[PDB]
């Protein structure tokens with residue numbers, strides 16, 4: 001095959017990759033912090049923490065939803081997905097997380 | 105009125121590391137995409153294409169006239185650090201970016 005510089009995707013996947021590309025290639029050494037602040041920092045530090053923290057919070061023991069709206073985080077949907085995530089989330093996740101989840 | 109105005113203070117570094125640490129270990133297997141849609145997906149997918157449009161354009165897109173504050177499409181705030189992204193940038197980055205900017 002001979003793709004000419006990939007293609008112009010319709011959805012957001014190019015600029016996206018930029019933020020990533022540096023983020024990853026950086027952690028290799030230690031610039032990921034200064035880079036993180038370059039293309040990721042506002043709703044990011046807020047909403048991104050949340051999601052990886054609400055899911056890793058209840059998907060660790062058994063449950064935990066009666067924590068009442070934490071407002072600063074959400075309190076409506078994103079808080080109750082971590083549960084149904086069993087299906088909601090992709091399937092290729094159980095393939096790896098079996099290991100990144102029980103290992104912790 | 106009182107909430108979300110000037111009380112900015114949230115030294116996050118835990119849930120944060122999850123989003124990161126999780127990715128780093130995944131990019132190896134190559135499933136960081138399905139995971140991204142997890143630790144990042146809403147204001148993230150957007151606010152990201154943003155900081156990237158500005159940063160990336162500031163380098164080879166010098167032409168930045170049909171962008172100056174299109175108001176609802178970026179944030180007038182975004183385009184401010186973008187003027188100081190110059191001085192205030194980290195130094196040792198000049199030694200790495202040679203590689204993360206020219207090559208990719």
Ligand SMILES: N[C@@H](Cc1c[nH]c2ccccc12)C(=O)O
Nearest residue numbers: 051052055078081141142143145
């Ligand atoms: N559900 C979205 C992102 C998301 C919303 N709420 C969440 C709570 C935790 C983690 C991720 C989410 C996804 O995974 O595509």
Ligand SMILES: N[C@@H](Cc1c[nH]c2ccccc12)C(=O)O
Nearest residue numbers: 037038041155158159182185186
């Ligand atoms: N690094 C910026 C985050 C950001 C918001 N808008 C931007 C525009 C360009 C680059 C980054 C941003 C900050 O310190 O808040």
